């Protein structure tokens, strides 16, 4: 149907929104503490700690799958980045801090794309 390819298209600019968000949002991390899985070798009781460990490479595999429906289920993602960083790391660390200033920063590029997806549909 035509009607299957008119929602691809679309699915396909929100996959090219949701990239353009992504590269934004991990611009945000310039130390790169959130770029890939936390390791399992150097971190062994991670999953002890966290159920849903997310990081910026693995949420861009998701995003070229075209896996993301909307804008919600990406920032789900985007937030388990920074509420895994604040529990499993304690307050006075570079990584707590680091997930501070990823969310702070993040928030205004949220903003804006929540407008674009509400504007452009
Ligand atoms: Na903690």
Redesign the pocket.
């Known amino acids: 149907s035509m009607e299957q390819v008119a929602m691809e298209l679309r699915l396909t600019e929100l996959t090219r929104l949701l990239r353009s968000v992504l590269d934004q949002l991990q611009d945000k991390d310039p130390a790169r503490i959130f770029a890939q899985p936390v390791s399992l070798k150097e971190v062994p009781d991670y999953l002890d700690h966290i159920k849903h460990p997310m990081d910026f490479a693995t949420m861009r595999k998701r995003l070229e799958a075209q896996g993301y429906k909307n804008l919600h289920e990406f920032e789900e993602d985007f937030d388990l980045i920074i509420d895994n960083c604040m529990?499993?790391?304690?307050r006075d660390t570079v990584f707590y801090r680091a997930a501070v200033r990823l969310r702070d920063q993040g928030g205004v590029v949220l903003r804006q794309a929540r407008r674009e997806v509400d504007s452009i549909g």
């Open positions: 529990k499993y790391n304690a």
